[PDB]
Amino acid sequence: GRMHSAGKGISSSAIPYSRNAPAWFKLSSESVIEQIVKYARKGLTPSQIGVLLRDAHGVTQARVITGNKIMRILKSNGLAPEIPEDLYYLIKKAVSVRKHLERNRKDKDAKFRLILIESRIHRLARYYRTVAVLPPNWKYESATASALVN
Amino acid sequence: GKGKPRGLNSARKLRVHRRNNRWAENNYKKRLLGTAFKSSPFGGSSHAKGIVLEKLGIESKQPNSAIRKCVRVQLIKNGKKVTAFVPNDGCLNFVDENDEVLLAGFGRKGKAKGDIPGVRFKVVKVSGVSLLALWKEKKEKPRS
Amino acid sequence: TRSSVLADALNAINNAEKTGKRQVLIRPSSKVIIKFLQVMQKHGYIGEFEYIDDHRSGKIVVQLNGRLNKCGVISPRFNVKIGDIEKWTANLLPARQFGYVILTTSAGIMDHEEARRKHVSGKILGFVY
RNA sequence: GAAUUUGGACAAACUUGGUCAUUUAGAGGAACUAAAAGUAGGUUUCCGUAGGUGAACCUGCGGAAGGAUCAUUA
RNA sequence: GGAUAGUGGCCUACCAUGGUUUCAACGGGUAACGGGGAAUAAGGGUUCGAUUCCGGAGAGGGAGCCUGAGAAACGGCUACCACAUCCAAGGAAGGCAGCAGGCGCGCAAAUUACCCAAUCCUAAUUCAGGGAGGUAGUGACAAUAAAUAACGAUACAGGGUCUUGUAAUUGGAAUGAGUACAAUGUAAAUACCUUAACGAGGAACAAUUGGAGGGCAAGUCUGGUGCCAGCAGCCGCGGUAAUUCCAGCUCCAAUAGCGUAUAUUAAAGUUGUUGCAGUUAAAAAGCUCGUAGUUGAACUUUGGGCCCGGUUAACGGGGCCUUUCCUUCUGGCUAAACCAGGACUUUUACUUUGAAAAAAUUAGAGUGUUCAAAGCAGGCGUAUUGCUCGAAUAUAUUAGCAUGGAAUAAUAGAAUAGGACGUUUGGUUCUAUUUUGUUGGUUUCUAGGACCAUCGUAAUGAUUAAUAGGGACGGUCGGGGGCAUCAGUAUUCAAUUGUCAGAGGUGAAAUUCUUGGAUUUAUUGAAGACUAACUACUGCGAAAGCAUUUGCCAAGGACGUUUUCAUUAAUCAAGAACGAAAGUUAGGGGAUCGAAGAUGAUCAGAUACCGUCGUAGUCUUAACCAUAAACUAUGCCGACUAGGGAUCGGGUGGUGUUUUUUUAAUGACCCACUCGGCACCUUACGAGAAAUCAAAGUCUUUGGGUUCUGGGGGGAGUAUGGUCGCAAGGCUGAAACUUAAAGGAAUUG
């Protein structure tokens, strides 16, 4: 089920049984690539690029049209951020809930949720520095993480 | 499932769990604490020898009784005083005070066989000769 | 989480036979599951199975024909030295004339009589009778 | 070339100080025993905790049933 | 460097600051010499191994040392310690855990015997010596074989003319327990095997040990003994917590053996890997996070054809082709490509085979020790100079070595190309087995490497996106949390007012307030707490818990998604967050209720043990404590198995309903479907001791992953130790002893 909850939901997306280039698309293969790098240069994460492409321009998913995934496209042209997207968002959430916990001391529910979020951050950071994406230590700390997010 | 580890490399947890569980027994706990040597009435032995301190008259009931009473005996090696069970009537007059009786167990691993509470030993020899044969007028007691 | 897919397949087949169904669907699929089903199919314990292929892992539809008493998996997969093989049979088969235990040897996945005939052995995998 | 002698390493052992541990004397007390034989009433059952009482026991706060659901309509 | 026979922190001088450990280091115990092995036999295990073989260590405790190849030797020496011997009192000598033997200790263990004859050892060595060893004595440790009787005749009972048993009936045969000429045996004897002579008629030459309610086999026996306010009266009957009180007859089991005591093993699945249990019988941490540990989705050469060839058409073997034998090099066919040949795991785990593995022991083949336990003997002949078989085989489950396999489970490779391949060209860096007579140095060529750059050669290099997971977004949803704010009656108190004699309290009184007006009524004000009815077999939260309005702050599940990354996960000692009520230290405020306390009346009955006042507390802030029947008495993750009706959240569809004021969005409702919840009813495909359970199912046909806890009842959550807490106390947590039951679930008197 979940990782830090009692839920057991299964809501997700379902990739179709067709790896071949839907016929009503028939537009291009590279034009979406410089459009993707334009969207990234505008300042979006790969997930936001994907949702805008499937909401506006009929790209079912960028993996089937181009042959490469979105993050590899951004990494190929030197648009990759120094830390990955999901770890960045987890650190941002931890910073916000830590500010809230600082202003309201007696919120013990926020204390428990912060402990859960930080344990999730530690697991993800251990995976990233194991697969050699992050620097070999990267030393997640309470203070400098704020200076890490902005 | 079953509540225990089952991995192929999970033998150390099984071993230490079995060690602790075996410590929660009674035979193993007394065997590997050496209880039969420090606190046992014997020295972890089968028979023993001791002088008869006194003879105590615990009868069955009020005067219409069956005479089943025996003696209080102090040991030779431990110096500990226990109570015995002399066999049937006619054997009671043989065992006097300070009579160097040889004793055995009674047959329930340290528990009282029979309906006499508080006896775990029985006299096997009196004055270092016999008790069964001396009762059956087959031999005679040597003097001192 | 899914520790063993072979356990799921064998438990599904046992439950389907004990309920009294005709065909059963198994997900996921594996080379080990396929080879186990091929041995069970060769010895007549199951009927005919098909490999439905989506892109992810596959599914298997097995059509049973009865004559299946019990199939089961042995987790963990112990190393079975050859002189020990009949010992395993003597633990978990009802008799000596029928009943099979399945060994994953370096010559493939095979029943124990073929393992004794080929003078080869390996890890244990499961049993069927 | 003996008795004898200087220094050193190897060191048994004796005197003191501390420490570890076993056994035995010692007021006091509390427990248990067979002690054949001493001085009518309340009845929900508990749990945690606080206070009080020769004596179980009582009271305050929170919790459990290991406590016996009838009539009606929908 | 010293020292040693030699390496070495083995020691010394100098310099570094290292080494081991939750995969349990270091410390403590051992009624611990280690092993070959022993008992137990369905398997796996459990228990013992002082002891006949191998290795270690010691000779009362330590230390030191000469001789010698070898000793830190003690049937050698020296000193100290503890014992202790001798005497002329000056001095001298000591070491049985060698063989006998003595004392002591104990439940527990033999002759101060004979001999080198065997086996081997020592010496100058065939010859001497050997308490090593062998022989005999004691010996019911254990083990082997089997004496205490067999056959008739007569009379009866039979089945019934051939077969059994009975008998104070009867006949003779056979033989060794012993005694013993002899011979053998033996170093000399004893004993065994052989044997002249003697040796059997029952109190002979005599078999015992336990038992007879059940377990567990065999008494619907006999007599006597001790008790009676039971009947009779001196004969007795019957009863006797006489737990039989004792003898005799008869019977059962084993037998030259049988019983008892302690320990251990099997039956025991009361240790449970195989193979236990945890709703209620012992036992699921109050809940969650989380390190070590254990465990972890699928995927990459499959298939086909060809032959040859092993066993009685089936099983199993290897080479060729199918894009398919890749790799480290010499000698030849040749014009980088073949043959004859030396071999190779990126790293493992696993598995087959093999070597090297003391004997004895175990399993086992042969052989009539007269049989057998044993032993490795033996067998056959013209038994006159002889012949010949054998002393096998197996097991050894870890580690190390060699080897065939490549399923299963792991590890790595090209993502900033810094990747591979070459008769692609340039430069640098080094080396020479050589030839110029051998050598040292100098140079070129040649050949071999390594490095830095440019041409190409190529299908140039990135597995799915798990009805695993985390992330993003969209619309929601909730009595989820914090802060601030708003409201509702109610309770208590106060002010003003109306009217009069009681108001409270109890089963009955009394204390209490009251003609300065009690209780009651009306208007108003203040304080603190709490949020009824709505409120449900509804919701939210990890649990504890959460119920007036509004706003802010951050969070959360479920649904939807042709979004994102590609294993990031499950469980979890160490460690940590929260944790009802009660309780502790200070501040606040104190309306109700209220431990403690104070008073009233205590009336057989309180069945109806009370009343009033009231401290701490109840509320809050900052610190503490960490326990509850913290309960669903049911750990967490995953898979599958059965029908039905409600209900909450999200989504999909309806030429469906309703309100629009025109039937457009949207809301409420109905029908169908789906996902995720809280629950409910019936049933057993199943389970269970039952109550009952869709999980407590998928289990004698026993294995998806993982953590914690239990081992008959008391003593006892007690004692002691540690640790946390100001304290209360919490966490961990025994033993001696005592007992044959304690207990769970239903039906019935």
Numbering used by the authors:
A (entry chain SN): 2 to 151
B (entry chain SX): 2 to 145
C (entry chain SW): 2 to 130
Paper text:
Biogenesis of the small ribosomal subunit in eukaryotes starts in the nucleolus with the formation of a 90S precursor and ends in the cytoplasm. Here, we elucidate the enigmatic structural transitions of assembly intermediates from human and yeast cells during the nucleoplasmic maturation phase. By combining yeast and human structures, we uncovered 16 different pre-40S assembly intermediates, most of which represent the long-sought nucleoplasmic pre-40S ribosome.
The most notable feature of Tsr1-1, the earliest state, is the highly flexible 40S head. Unlike the highly dynamic 40S head, the 5' and central domains of the 18S rRNA are almost mature, as in the primordial pre-40S. This allows the helices h27 and h44 of the 18S rRNA to mature, and the CPK to fully assemble. After the release of Bms1 and association of Bud23, the Tsr1-1 state in yeast, which directly precedes Tsr1 recruitment, displays the rRNA h18 in a new immature conformation and a highly flexible 40S head. However, the time point at which this occurs is not clearly defined; indeed, states Tsr1-1 and Tsr1-2 were both observed with and without uS5 incorporated. Although, we were missing the states that could show the remodeling of the primordial pre-40S (now described by Cheng et al.NAR), the Tsr1 states are likely to represent the earliest nucleoplasmic intermediates, in which the 40S head is prepared for further remodeling.
